[PDB]
């Protein structure tokens, strides 16, 4: 079994180390952070609409 072997373990592990050190940043910037920003957008939009309505309501409430 090669899965139990060690005669070329370093070169074999270079695949994981390249994935970790060089490909993970690309996936981070190109795929993951974009998806999570996209997920964030709706709630932030809703909260900021509510904040603007709150400002308008306070503006109206101070009139007499």
């Amino acid at each position: 079994l090669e899965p139990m072997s060690t005669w070329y373990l370093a070169s074999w592990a270079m695949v994981w180390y390249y994935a970790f050190f060089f490909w993970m940043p690309m996936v981070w910037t190109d795929i993951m952070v974009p998806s999570f920003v996209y997920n964030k957008l709706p709630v932030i939009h809703f909260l900021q609409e509510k904040r603007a309505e709150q400002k308008l309501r306070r503006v109206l409430d101070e009139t007499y």
Partner: protein, 154 residues
């Protein structure tokens, strides 16, 4: 000895580039618990408890691109080696453990001494502490062993 080889993800890398040049929402995550650690409100942690989210997401993507697609005949799991998985788990587990140890807070380890003051310290509590310190490393080993054995047997 220097062996030059390539992973079996090149077509999947091509598909990722083609299908993720534009943004898309993600709403289904294999391990969602990394995002919600605190369940009672008004509780907060001064430690960087959300540092694992990025590594978790990348690890899930990588292991899924390998393991799930390996069901297709002649698809190769390029990393399927016991000691390589040991290296991966060593990196993650020991890195987090050293993050907690570099904090230089020894009281953090008070809970390792299992039991209460009623129990004899040398013959019960100290032996339990020895076993628990052993169990941390055994948890690392068992994690990587379980991942390797399941794939191999299946």
């Amino acid at each position: 000895m220097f062996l030059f080889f390539f992973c079996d993800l090149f077509w999947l890398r091509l598909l990722l580039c083609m299908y993720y040049c534009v943004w898309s929402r993600l709403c289904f995550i294999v391990y969602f618990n990394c995002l919600m650690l605190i369940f009672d409100f008004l509780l907060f942690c001064l430690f960087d408890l959300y540092l694992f989210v990025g590594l978790c997401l990348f690890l899930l993507l990588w292991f899924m691109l390998f393991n799930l697609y390996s069901l297709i005949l002649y698809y190769c799991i390029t990393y399927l080696n016991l000691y390589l998985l040991f290296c991966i788990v060593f990196l993650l587990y020991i890195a987090f453990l050293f993050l907690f140890c570099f904090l230089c807070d020894f009281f953090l380890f008070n809970n390792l001494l299992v039991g209460d003051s009623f129990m004899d310290v040398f013959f019960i509590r100290f032996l339990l502490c020895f076993l628990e310190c052993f169990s941390l490393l055994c948890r690392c080993l068992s994690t990587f062993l379980r991942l390797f054995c399941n794939l191999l047997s299946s």
